[PDB]
Amino acid sequence: TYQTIKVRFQASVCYITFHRPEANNTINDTLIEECLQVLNQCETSTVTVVVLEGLPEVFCFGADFQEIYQEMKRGRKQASSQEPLYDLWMKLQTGPYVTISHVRGKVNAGGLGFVSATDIAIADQTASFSLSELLFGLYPACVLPFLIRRIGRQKAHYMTLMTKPISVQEASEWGLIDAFDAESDVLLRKHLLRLRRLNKKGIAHYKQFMSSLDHQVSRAKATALTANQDMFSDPQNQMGIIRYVETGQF
């Protein structure tokens, strides 16, 4: 039945809605498992499209912080792997179905992983995207390979260094999102309308082909994960993250 998402099938489409309101659409470890589980059902079933949503004002911000701290004030000694999260985002790009992000509101590193990884990302006037991690000495290591595949190295670089959220317009110009509109529901339906017309078999073979042509994402996985461990095990980054979840930034 799921603790973090609301699943809803409709014909050949599957809707995954993130239902995590008290930790602002933040990512836990149960959420990752439930998604992998939903995607496996979509693996052989009759579904050809998977839609991600549930963001009246936030598709997903990113790695919960009070969690990264609360764990520290429990017994945390060395960071937790993000391999499951990374593989999930990889699945979105590789599975036998067209994945789509439906974004509304603020999205930070984390929701950014999701939007970047989906085969198609749509939004409305409200969507804004940001990477503030560098203010705390961190950086979206897991997100970056997916982001980079969409907008290029320079755009992802400027974004990370500048820390300021970008508009839905720039996201569009950069390739972060394909199509956006004030009526992003109608816009979604126009996409689903065209997507049905495709069959699971052609989609799966087509996506497999694109995957073999480009190993960029998989090739960077260990480096990203190695970097994730490291930046989180580094003292200073830690106190920075800590000294903030109580007081200042620096």
Swiss-Prot record:
UniProt-listed Pfam families: ECH_1
Domain of life: Bacteria
Pathway the protein takes part in: Antibiotic biosynthesis; bacillaene biosynthesis
Catalytic site positions: 64, 133
Major localization class: cytoplasm
Localization terms from the record: Cytoplasm
Any one Gene Ontology BP term: antibiotic biosynthetic process
EC top class, as a word: lyase
GO CC annotations on file: cytoplasm
EC id: 4.2.1.-
A single MF term (Gene Ontology): lyase activity
Impact when changing residue 64 to A: Reduces the enzymatic activity
Cystines in this chain: none
This protein's UniProt keywords: Antibiotic biosynthesis, Cytoplasm, Lyase
PROSITE patterns in UniProt: ENOYL_COA_HYDRATASE (PS00166)
Family matches, as PANTHER family: ENOYL-COA HYDRATASE (PTHR42964), POLYKETIDE BIOSYNTHESIS ENOYL-COA HYDRATASE PKSH-RELATED (PTHR42964:SF1)
NCBIfam families referenced in this protein's UniProt entry, alphabetically: PRK07112.1
Cited function: Involved in some intermediate steps for the synthesis of the antibiotic polyketide bacillaene which is involved in secondary metabolism. Catalyzes the dehydration of the (S)-3-hydroxy-3-methylglutaryl group tethered to PksL to a 3-methylglutaconyl moiety.
Entry's family note: Belongs to the enoyl-CoA hydratase/isomerase family.
Entry protein name: Bacillaene synthase dehydratase PksH
